[PDB]
């Protein structure tokens, strides 16, 4: 019986899989912690040793046909193995593809632009070019950087991206998908569970249908920022047009965070910071992670584990014993978990601690599941938990209770706005950009945009959705979207949209369990065990269930909503509607920073 056949094969697989994974992860941990040339190749040995096992099992598992299995939980693991991946290509093609991929990332990571005046000082992107766009207030300098990065690097990526599209499309069509676009939406798909189904085509409807409710709030937030930029760059921004693309804080415009210093509503009142009340009380980078653990215990979740305290990197070594401190949580499997981060006594690290312990508390939940079912219910559930845990540990109603933030301290309704607008510049600022970027790629990957209208459609959608106009016209020899990291490194970009929505659906559905009364942005789930159950019933599922059934166990619905995101920003929406009396909310997509010096030619 095919059923039993597989059922036995999966069982035999699990052991080898788990042990090889353990040995493969330990190597990378030892490398990242202890940077030695010796450990570099050891990690590669273990990694390839593991990765070959996956290919062997994948081919070996292609025997059992899918449409016989009834036990859903095994039909789910098999689907993760039968996936042919990119092996379905040819040989020469498959090794041309890897060459293109390795050439595109190298250009992004090493390409450099340099000054017109002194052509000897060249600037990378990682340091230097970012800080120019993030700190400068000089119009001409920002424009020079913005244009030159797209000209001397975008122009290189164009003929490579044109080939990458073509190859990836064949790699997808040979897997019974329509194109690469339809391949990427393969993460949100559910099949045959009686009411929890979700077709790869519905994702477009949901994304385009929830975005029409953020447009009213984004329009006001956009019309307010524009009115505050006409004081920092006068005579450069017209008050009924879009915003020039290089005056948005970041090189691409993904986050508007770096516009805070120009747009702070009440500049006199300072925001809530406690980086100093920690020093006066002598908080080392171990009282932090104890406070985080205590916060998690208060909710109802379990303690940490001995191994966690033992073999982790809560502190920077300091000597030439070298390491990377990009803060990460590690799930080496077999029953140990460990964090890695060079902790500084600060506030933005007192939050990152809670964030990472969020991932860790996730992993400890589903660690009783078959190896292939150890992951978020979909791609946007992991980082949508770290957030809601770092979102409830920054509220004064919690800081004045952990010990910081002296008890005689009542917050006024002006720091509330000072804080909400700092949030909205990061949350709501990046929703239209993400939506537009993924729409463009979904439309390119299906030939709905001929290869000679790429940039034209790009800058046509920018002015219409995001409301951002370019400062110099870009013909078809450019490729601007390939200048972003995620685009020129082959990464899906829709997780950052749906994550933002889940992040608030969970937060809103948890405060009602903790019996909150006031506005949503002042909620705190601590000390409320009956709201730790509602969360623990979703973590303790891994991937064993369709993600809609996971959502139902917390929110009470079966689809992403956008109402809870608007209830969060209500006290800001009201104030903005009041501040935009004598302005023009919206924009007109014909203005352009160069349309007052251009001459029009007409030939017959």
């Amino acid at each position: 019986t095919i059923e039993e056949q597989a059922k036995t094969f999966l069982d035999k697989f699990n052991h080898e899989a788990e042990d090889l994974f353990y040995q493969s992860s330990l190597a990378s941990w030892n490398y990242n912690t202890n940077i030695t040339e010796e450990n570099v190749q050891n990690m590669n040995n273990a990694g390839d040793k593991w990765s070959a096992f996956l290919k062997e099992q994948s081919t070996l598992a292609q025997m059992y046909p899918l449409q016989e299995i009834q036990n859903l939980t095994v039909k789910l693991q098999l689907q993760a193995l039968q996936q042919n991946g990119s092996s379905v290509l040819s040989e020469d093609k498959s090794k041309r593809l890897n060459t293109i991929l390795n050439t595109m990332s190298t250009i992004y990571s090493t390409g450099k632009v340099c000054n017109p005046d002194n052509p000897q000082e060249c600037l990378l992107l990682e340091p230097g070019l970012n800080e120019i766009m993030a700190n400068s207030l000089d119009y001409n300098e920002r424009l020079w950087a913005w244009e030159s990065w797209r000209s001397e690097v975008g122009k290189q990526l164009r003929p490579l991206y044109e080939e990458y599209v073509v190859l990836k499309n064949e790699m997808a069509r040979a897997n019974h998908y329509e194109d690469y676009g339809d391949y990427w939406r393969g993460d949100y798909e559910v099949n045959g569970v009686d009411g929890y189904d979700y077709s790869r085509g519905q994702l477009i409807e949901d994304v385009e249908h929830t975005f029409e409710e953020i447009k009213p709030l984004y329009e006001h937030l956009h019309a307010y920022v524009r009115a505050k930029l006409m004081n920092a760059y006068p005579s450069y921004i017209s008050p009924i047009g879009c915003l020039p693309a290089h005056l948005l804080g970041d090189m691409w415009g993904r986050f508007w965070t770096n516009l805070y210093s120009l747009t702070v509503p009440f500049g006199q009142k300072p925001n809530i910071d406690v980086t100093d009340a920690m020093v006066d009380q002598a908080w080392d980078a171990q009282r932090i992670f104890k406070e985080a653990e205590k916060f998690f215990v208060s909710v109802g979740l379990p303690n940490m584990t001995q191994g966690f305290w033992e073999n982790s990197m809560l502190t920077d070594p300091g000597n030439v014993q070298k390491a990377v401190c990009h803060p990460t949580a590690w799930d080496l499997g077999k029953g140990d978990f460990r964090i890695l981060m060079c902790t500084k006594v600060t506030m933005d690290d007192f939050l990152t601690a809670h964030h990472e312990m969020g991932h860790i508390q996730y992993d400890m939940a589903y660690a009783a599941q078959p190896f292939l079912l150890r992951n978020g219910a979909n791609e946007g559930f992991h980082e949508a938990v770290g957030e809601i845990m770092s979102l409830s540990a920054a509220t004064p109603k919690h800081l004045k209770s952990i010990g910081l933030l002296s008890p005689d301290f009542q917050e006024d309704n002006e720091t509330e706005i000072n804080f909400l607008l700092k949030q909205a510049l990061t949350i709501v600022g990046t929703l239209p950009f993400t939506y537009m970027l993924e729409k463009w790629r979904w439309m390119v990957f299906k030939g709905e945009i001929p290869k000679d209208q790429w940039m034209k459609k790009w800058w046509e959608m920018k002015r219409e959705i995001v409301g951002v106009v370019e400062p110099v016209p870009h013909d078809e020899t450019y490729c601007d979207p390939a200048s972003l990291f995620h685009v020129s490194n082959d990464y899906s970009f829709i997780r950052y949209y749906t994550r933002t929505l889940y992040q608030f659906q969970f937060q809103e559905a948890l405060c009602q369990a903790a019996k909150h009364e006031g506005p949503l942005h002042k909620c705190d789930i601590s000390n409320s065990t009956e709201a730790g159950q509602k969360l623990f019933n979703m973590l303790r599922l891994g991937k064993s269930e369709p993600w809609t059934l996971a959502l139902e166990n917390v929110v009470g619905a079966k689809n992403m909503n956008v109402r809870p995101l608007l209830n969060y920003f209500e006290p800001l929406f009201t104030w903005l509607k009041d501040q935009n009396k004598n302005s023009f909310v919206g924009w007109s997509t014909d203005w352009s920073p160069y349309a007052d010096q251009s001459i029009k030619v007409r030939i017959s």
Binding site: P116, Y139, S148, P473, Q597, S598, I599, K600
Partner: protein
């Protein structure tokens, strides 16, 4: 910018290597007045 069937586009001129330096329009309107008779015959067009 804005190439089209009618072939009616827009154009503007910047300094040699300074992307943020647009030559004011009332000087481009004079250089072209000076050399229009020589731009025309390069394409065989005739000022109409």
């Amino acid at each position: 910018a804005n190439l089209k069937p009618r072939i009616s586009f827009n154009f503007f001129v910047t300094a040699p290597k300074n992307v943020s330096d647009i030559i004011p329009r009332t000087e481009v309107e004079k250089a072209i007045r000076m050399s229009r008779s020589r731009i025309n015959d390069a394409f065989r067009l005739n000022d109409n």
